[PDB]
Design an enzyme around this catalytic site. Structure first.
Site, PDB file in Angstrom:
ATOM      1  N   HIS A  67       5.622  -6.286  12.281  1.00 35.57           N
ATOM      2  CA  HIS A  67       5.782  -4.829  12.274  1.00 35.57           C
ATOM      3  C   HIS A  67       4.422  -4.226  11.948  1.00 35.57           C
ATOM      4  O   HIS A  67       3.797  -3.648  12.818  1.00 35.57           O
ATOM      5  CB  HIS A  67       6.901  -4.438  11.335  1.00 35.57           C
ATOM      6  N   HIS A  79       8.734  -2.891   4.861  1.00 33.40           N
ATOM      7  CA  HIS A  79       9.832  -2.129   5.473  1.00 33.40           C
ATOM      8  C   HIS A  79      11.034  -2.968   5.689  1.00 33.40           C
ATOM      9  O   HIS A  79      11.968  -2.559   6.367  1.00 33.40           O
ATOM     10  CB  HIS A  79       9.375  -1.372   6.741  1.00 33.40           C
TER      11      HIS A  79
HETATM   12  S1  FES Z   1       5.065  -4.363   7.675  1.00 31.74           S
HETATM   13 FE1  FES Z   1       6.753  -5.822   7.515  1.00 31.74          FE
HETATM   14  S2  FES Z   1       8.619  -4.653   7.753  1.00 31.74           S
HETATM   15 FE2  FES Z   1       6.905  -3.217   8.064  1.00 31.74          FE
END
Ligand code: FES
Ligand code: MGD
Ligand code: MGD
Ligand code: F3S
Ligand code: F3S
Ligand code: FES
Ligand code: CL
Ligand code: CL
Ligand code: CL
Ligand code: 4MO
Ligand code: 4MO
Ligand code: O
Ligand code: O
EC number: 1.20.9.1
Lengths: 822, 133, 822, 133
Positions: free
Chosen positions: B62, B81
């Site tokens: 992500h 997140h």
């Molecule tokens: S950086 Fe890992 S869930 Fe957003």
């Protein structure tokens, strides 16, 4: 794949609001020739990032699924890259898993969009074939004209979006609403998510509180946030991530103290009203600790009892704002009497212990040491909107909120969290009756039914009854059409119309894809989505933005407002040819060449000199907004209503509603309402008495809606090859089921299927099934019961569960691990 | 040439790895942290005597926050997140905000030497234009 | 894009026969890890080609469509490259446009095969869902068992492939045949391309001449080739290109003269019997010159008159082989009488001028100067197989061929060109009647119908009547299933069976893809194609080859022979549970773990000690063939029948049949037959009398069959977005149509649609439409008429044409330029 | 880097081309023969004042035989196995044995100079591993 093509420093960049949920996160679309690329040095690519060495964490959101190569109508190929805008105040550079797929979900001939509708499709009695737009129009308008001439508008049925974002927005709601209501003048219109022409928020609106009354910044300023019938990590992800969590973490305390120098701000707390323990409750506990989260795990359908108990309690304690009540409200003393419920009784009905009811009330309503009431933001969504009596639950909730003055103060609000974005501008609905459209179609009413940007085969309440009736009525038309040979269009219109006098129904879908509707439809017309067209819409804090066109649509696909114009102009021409000047005049006002013409005709004319009656979320200052002015505002846009525009300051908007205590009622006061507690509806109680499991239903973070794009995505189909049902593990053992087994889920209303997903947090006798899906449609088991305004209790149904078998391939390939972050 | 030039990096020998005890290593350079783990029960594309050794990039796909391996669930967890990836299903995202599965580090198991060697990556590692910088 | 990944020098390489047409060109599949590649130096890549500089022409056939990246069940990713084998004698390195796409049409989750069937699919009254293999088998075997117990085998219907190649072959035809005929023992079976259990070649077979009697080399040795009802450039491409054209070009003259040192070999000539001027006629003229090609442009359906006139004429001239006739034939004197037709009457019926008839005869049959009769190879295909009375036309033609000794001499033969590859091994058909299956289903017979590797919705004759009836009967079952709630499998079998006593029909499809059959099916099962399985088949010269497995099938897809065993074993277990030994014993002999087991049980047992009765194109020496031995033979395989095997010389086969004048009849003589000329069938004549256009139909070079893969290919969908109809330009002007207009094509039998394709070479009042397609099904307008053995006259139909409209997007994107090479 | 390094090769100025009179040139090297032609009527992706100038590699995408431009049909014909490509439909294969359309040579038209420049190729030229050797 193990590399990506960077955008050149000079790549074209346009703005794009996320296609999907209410939050309306800001994105940039970079577009450049296929055979060019940016350099790794930061000043040689459009991202301004240094790819000569590893990027630190949080520097970018960028994966191959955020890129594509599109092919324009001229045959030229262009790289695109769709990535979140770091400087947009909504999301601060965040991208959810749903919006992060936008580039993959843009049309290409070879990718996830391959099957996009790209020409009119006709079911010519026993096969699907392509047809021309002009023939499609001759057939469709021909049948609407015949119906209007013989039966009137009551023979012409629609189910149409009324939302924002992709398959919505101010241009498109106006085009379709002008067509349906001003031109055809049919009252036989339902909405994409509900089976009549109504509102989700009749009670709060009639009480004088519009449901989007605050700013996302208020979630940063709150002392307490309530999340009522709502799973916001999964369903409003970046609002929860970018605004709620930073409050829970202590990152916004200085902002509160700066604004209010003489007010105590304790550590922020969060209260969930949800029969189910969700990923949102798990994540809130992870971040805030157990002692700062209350999960009021009510019995299904008991929200009214909860709020009546809490209202009675705060009034008995004096934890209410007596001067606000006297100056700005009506009907308080009456509500105190009608809504009286003791905490013991509240506890017995809801199953929530008295000590947790008291704690919720103390955190949220008892004055702080410095004297002020806590700033408590009350956010709600479909757990109560589709709950046990939509109108009554809002009545009860708003009573509590109004008494405690938690509207109109910063850090407060009693608001919808939202679903889709919003973007409503339409003429008034042309009747005064509430009409349950599904039931009318099932009973055999209507000659022609058009699904427009929705798919009620997957999403209606009591969906199995609907599908069965539509399939049957469609087959009558198919059968009649087969006998034709060399029929002129006029003759075909007559063959079809005759079949509809014998129980038939002609079915049109206007869509991006065929969908399950293709099982019944006779006609499908291709539509265009944002980026293929310009589009305007607002998010859950009324922030209107322009999404910019950057590519062509597939084949002859068209913006929905322009399809409505096409239909109106085909009808006008037919009436003029037939010497019917008065009917032709009803179809005036659709001389539109581009979507902006629809924005100018609708949103920008509301309340203007000489304009017809127009209901618009932009209000009468909407004319101040133009595409060029929105473009200049960027992805921060402007919060509606616009108060002023000039060249020097841009668009200036409105952060919070009701800050002077003047509400949207005849007297400017908020109105309290009685909220009777009646138990579950009898229709629902009957299923519950006969069957074992509560069939709770709703959203999964990764899956968007009916999975119209997701169904083509290999990653999505690997992860969720079938709709799943969360089940308590003891209940699974009793049924000899485990992860990846298939079960049938059934009751008196219908039967459907799901893959078993054991989940420790699910309560004995309760389940949760993914709604709306392409393999195992949840809505088959939902009842026909609706509230006074025909709002369904989609979350209110019970059924039994029977093992079909073990699907070894699901066991081999799907993770059944916990989706609640510990 | 269409392929990246991935190094061949010795991780360890298979018999030294204990069941469900992760091994940290960098691949394909010292800025790309990875984990190898002997899962204890076979998984598709697991290597070694028991077809159960797998390896991954640990940077969340992500926004790059380093994930932590959870022994009890056999998952990699990102607390920024809240994305979670299944080590037993080739990095399948269980729930979260990423749009790519956790990148798998392709391991050769050499029966003659007992050696495990990292030899490529399936998926694009966070925060890089190509897996080999 | 603009590059390819070369196979490493040490890449795995397996053999694969083209999936598609009869020619059976040889390919190699290179497989290697995704992240590896070969070097450009010739010894550093598996092709052995030097990519350091431009390759000369003819060095390679390699495009990006000939590569892919597959993902196996273990999640590991592999480059594949599927390219033609230079050293295969069939194709000598040639690839057609259809075979050349094989790599693109291998299963990948993101590519052209994304919509492959991956799991059993069940239509549970009003929706498609996944189901388990074990539940599918419980329902399917359950229904078949109940039908056998109550109605007997006559209630269980099939339409099944009988062919070779992909979706056929020796393993697969045996598995299905054993199941249908030995185990279930149903006579209610039709074939993929014809609506009864019959042969395309009853007449030639009964005359003693099996239809594949020569070698492809014979086309190289001929003086004259006749192509009768055949468009070989488009339909048997690499046989035409690699064997026919080199003869026309003079490249094989030296071979002829080396074989026959005392025989004159004039320049080779070619004769086409086809009402339509095709790309094959055009290319033949291009290569040979106009003077070396005769196009006998006969009136539709007059083949019998043509051959009777020619037979009469050669007998009158003495251009026959009297000693051959006397020694090796029976019936000649009778055939001379029954088939007498003068050249003037012949010319009147056919429309071919007397001078061209005499010329065709002089080229083909008049003895050469050196004394020997010309070596004239007579090739025919669906222009007569599906022509005006299949049995009679073959009688007429074979009479001509036999009298002129044009079977059994090198450079001769009277042969099918073929369609699919061949690969037939089956038990005898278990009835003594021919039964017109489509008519039986239309009339309401049967409980359960399985389409297995065919799609008669797109391909039946009188297709519109078939689809209408099946859709109706299916809906009855769908309706009955909808009332079920928590039904066991046994209860659902009973529900369905009862709906079939009220007009219903349970419909199963076993396929690669949903297809249009998904509009009616209740159950679909996922099959595997060559490369996902091992498979054996033979081409048009009986050359058997092994196609090798190199990847996994999608999901739980399975080889058709293993599906048949799974059904058989499910039925056996049921009967054993129910205590019925005698019935259970019928389902013995399916203990198969891999497709090779089916090859050993069927092909390899034919004629062997203790074997049941087995009809096999391998004959009784089939047992000499094994997978290992075929693998060692490579893509050259062996021509059947095998004569010997040993380690030192491999498999030794048979080049030409009938070389000693011993034919497959009781007396070993070829038998002449009467061929009465009866004009067109009345059913067809009636359409002709009422309607204007001859509705010819067939193949296009680029499109394969029902377009099951092609429908997902963006290039193919760009080129042929709709089925096209070739029309004379003057007829077009009269109808006010041009390229890219849509027309309706209709008669008493049905109505369908096509895009107009003006073609100068089409005769006034004739047309040619693409058959079997996914958008505009041609067969709707074909009649129900069949010959004495239920062989349809698919090329025999007339209809009217009406303009629907101009499809501007077709005009913008589709080429309507000439497909006849000038 | 993910893109090939295509040269920028001057072909001529647009006003020098006569309608339907093809111009021969090599691109992206002297072993890659190409044709440019002013079609005389606009076609999607045509360049020049009349949006009608297109260019193609002339090596047949089947087996590499050089095609010839047919002025009367505005097609490229391969007489080895009879493949024909439509110059007015971006090299769409009208009939033939190829599995790729005729590769388009991307032309920049510069109004300031009247210059036509070859700057890329859309599709893979016969007989090469990459367009740029
Ligand atoms: S950086 Fe890992 S869930 Fe957003
Ligand atoms: N990932 C994802 N996000 C989306 C969508 C999507 O499809 N996917 N769709 C969007 C749309 S259109 C909408 S409307 C929103 C919906 O957003 P939400 O309404 O937040 O989502 P739901 O899952 O429908 O339901 C919320 C909660 O209601 C609870 N619930 C059930 N019955 C009751 C009850 O009787 N009382 C109470 N208090 N709670 C109850 C459920 O347990 C559930 O956790 O999400 C939007 N966001
Ligand atoms: N490209 C491609 N090749 C294929 C196929 C494919 O789908 N695409 N399918 C394969 C299959 S299964 C088959 S059976 C073969 C078919 O191969 P062919 O039979 O060669 O092909 P068709 O186009 O069916 O018909 C051949 C010719 O019959 C002519 N014809 C029509 N009526 C008459 C008549 O009354 N008398 C005579 N003499 N001729 C007539 C038509 O004009 C046509 O040119 O092709 C195979 N090869
Ligand atoms: S990325 Fe999209 S789906 Fe919602 S959380 Fe943001 S608007
Ligand atoms: S490549 Fe395939 S389609 Fe026929 S011509 Fe050769 S077998
Ligand atoms: S080389 Fe051009 S058609 Fe074969
Ligand atoms: Cl990705
Ligand atoms: Cl290609
Ligand atoms: Cl009966
Ligand atoms: Mo919603
Ligand atoms: Mo055939
Ligand atoms: O919604
Ligand atoms: O065939």
């Amino acid at each position: 794949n193990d590399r990506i093509t960077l955008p050149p420093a000079n790549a074209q960049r346009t703005n794009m609001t996320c296609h999907f949920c209410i939050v309306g996160c800001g994105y940039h679309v970079y577009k450049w020739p296929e055979l060019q690329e940016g350099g790794r040095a930061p000043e040689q690519n459009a991202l301004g990032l240094d790819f000569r060495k590893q990027l630190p964490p949080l520097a970018v959101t960028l994966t191959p699924a955020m890129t594509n190569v599109v092919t324009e109508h001229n045959g030229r190929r262009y790289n695109i890259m769709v990535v979140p805008d770091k400087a947009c105040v909504v999301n601060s550079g965040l991208s959810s898993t749903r919006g992060g797929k936008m580039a993959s979900y843009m049309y290409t001939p070879t990718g996830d969009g391959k099957q996009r509708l790209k020409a009119p499709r006709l079911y010519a009695a026993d096969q699907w074939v392509d047809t021309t737009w002009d023939h499609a129009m001759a057939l469709y308008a021909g049948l609407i004209k015949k119906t209007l001439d013989k039966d009137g508008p009551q023979g012409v049925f629609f189910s149409c979006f009324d939302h924002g974002g992709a398959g919505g927005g101010f241009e498109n709601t106006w085009g379709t609403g002008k067509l349906m209501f001003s031109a055809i003048q049919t009252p036989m219109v339902r909405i994409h998510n509900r089976p009549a022409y109504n509102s989700e928020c009749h009670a709060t609106r009639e009480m004088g509180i519009g449901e989007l009354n605050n700013a996302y910044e208020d979630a940063q300023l709150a002392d307490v946030i309530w999340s009522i019938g709502n799973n916001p990590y999964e369903s409003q992800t970046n609002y929860f991530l970018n605004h709620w969590l930073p409050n829970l973490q202590g990152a916004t305390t200085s902002k509160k103290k700066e604004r209010f120098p003489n007010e105590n701000f304790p550590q922020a707390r969060i209260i969930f009203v949800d029969p189910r323990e969700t990923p949102s409750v798990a994540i809130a506990r992870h971040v805030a600790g157990n002692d700062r989260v209350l999960h009021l795990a009510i019995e299904p359908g008991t929200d009214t009892a909860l709020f009546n108990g809490l209202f009675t309690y705060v009034v008995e304690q004096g934890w209410i704002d007596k001067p606000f009540i006297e100056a700005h409200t009506k009907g308080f003393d009456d509500a105190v009497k009608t809504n009286r419920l003791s905490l013991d009784e509240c506890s017995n009905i809801t199953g929530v212990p008295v000590d947790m009811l008291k704690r919720a009330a103390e955190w949220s309503y008892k004055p702080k040491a410095s004297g002020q009431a806590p700033r408590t933001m009350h956010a709600y969504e479909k757990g109560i909107i589709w709950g046990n009596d939509n109108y009554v639950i809002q009545s009860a909730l708003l009573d509590l909120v109004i008494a405690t003055h938690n509207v109109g103060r910063r850090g407060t609000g009693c608001v919808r969290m939202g679903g889709h974005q919003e973007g409503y501008t339409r003429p008034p609905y042309p009747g005064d009756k509430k009409i349950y459209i599904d039931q009318e179609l099932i009973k055999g009413k209507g000659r022609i039914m058009t699904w427009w940007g929705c798919n009620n085969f997957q999403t209606s309440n009591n969906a199995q009854a609907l599908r069965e009736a539509i399939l049957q009525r469609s087959a009558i038309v198919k059968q009649a059409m087969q006998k034709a040979r060399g029929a002129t269009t006029e003759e075909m219109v007559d063959v079809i119309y005759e079949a509809t006098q014998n129980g038939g129904l002609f079915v049109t879908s206007i869509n991006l894809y065929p969908t399950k509707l293709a099982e019944a439809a006779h006609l499908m017309l291709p539509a265009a989505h944002p980026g293929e067209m310009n589009l305007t819409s607002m998010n859950g804090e009324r922030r209107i933005r322009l999404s910019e066109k950057f590519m062509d649509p597939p084949g002859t696909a068209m913006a929905d407002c322009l399809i409505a114009a096409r239909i109106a102009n085909a009808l006008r021409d037919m009436y003029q040819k037939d010497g019917k000047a008065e009917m032709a005049a009803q179809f005036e006002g659709f001389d539109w060449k581009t979507e902006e013409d629809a924005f100018n005709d609708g949103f920008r004319r509301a309340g203007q000199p000489g304009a017809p009656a127009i209901d618009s979320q932009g209000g009468s200052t909407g004319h101040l907004v133009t595409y060029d002015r929105l473009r200049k505002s960027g992805n921060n846009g402007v919060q509606l209503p616009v108060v002023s525009w000039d060249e020097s300051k841009g668009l200036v908007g409105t952060e919070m509603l009701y800050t002077e205590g003047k509400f949207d009622t005849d007297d400017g006061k908020a109105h309290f309402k009685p909220a009777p507690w009646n138990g579950l509806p009898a229709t629902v109680q009957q299923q519950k008495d006969k069957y074992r499991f509560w069939l709770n239903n709703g959203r999964n973070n990764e899956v968007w809606q009916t999975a119209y794009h997701d169904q083509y995505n290999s990653l999505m189909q690997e992860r969720y090859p079938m709709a799943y049902i969360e089940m308590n593990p003891d209940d699974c053992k009793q049924l000899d089921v485990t992860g990846g087994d298939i079960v049938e889920v059934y009751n008196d209303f219908g039967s459907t299927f799901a893959m078993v997903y054991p989940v420790a947090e699910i309560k004995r006798g309760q389940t949760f099934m993914l709604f709306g899906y392409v393999n195992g449609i949840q809505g088959d088991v939902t009842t026909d019961w609706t509230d006074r305004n025909i709002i369904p209790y989609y979350k209110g149904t019970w059924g039994d569960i029977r093992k079909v078998g073990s699907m070894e391939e699901f066991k081999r390939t799907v993770s059944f691990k916990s989706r609640r972050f510990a | 040439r269409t392929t990246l030039q991935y190094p061949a990096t010795q991780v360890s020998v298979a018999k030294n790895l204990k069941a469900n005890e992760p091994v940290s290593f960098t691949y394909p350079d010292t800025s790309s942290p990875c984990v190898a783990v002997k899962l204890g029960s076979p998984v598709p594309g697991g290597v070694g005597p028991n077809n159960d050794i797998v390896a991954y990039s640990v940077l969340c796909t992500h926004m790059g926050c380093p994930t932590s391996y959870d022994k009890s669930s056999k998952t990699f967890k990102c607390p920024c997140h809240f994305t979670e990836f299944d080590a037993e299903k080739a990095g399948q995202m269980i729930c979260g905000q990423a749009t790519e599965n956790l990148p798998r580090v392709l391991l050769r198991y050499d029966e003659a030497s007992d050696a495990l060697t990292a030899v490529g990556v399936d998926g694009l590692i966070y925060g890089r234009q190509a897996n080999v910088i």
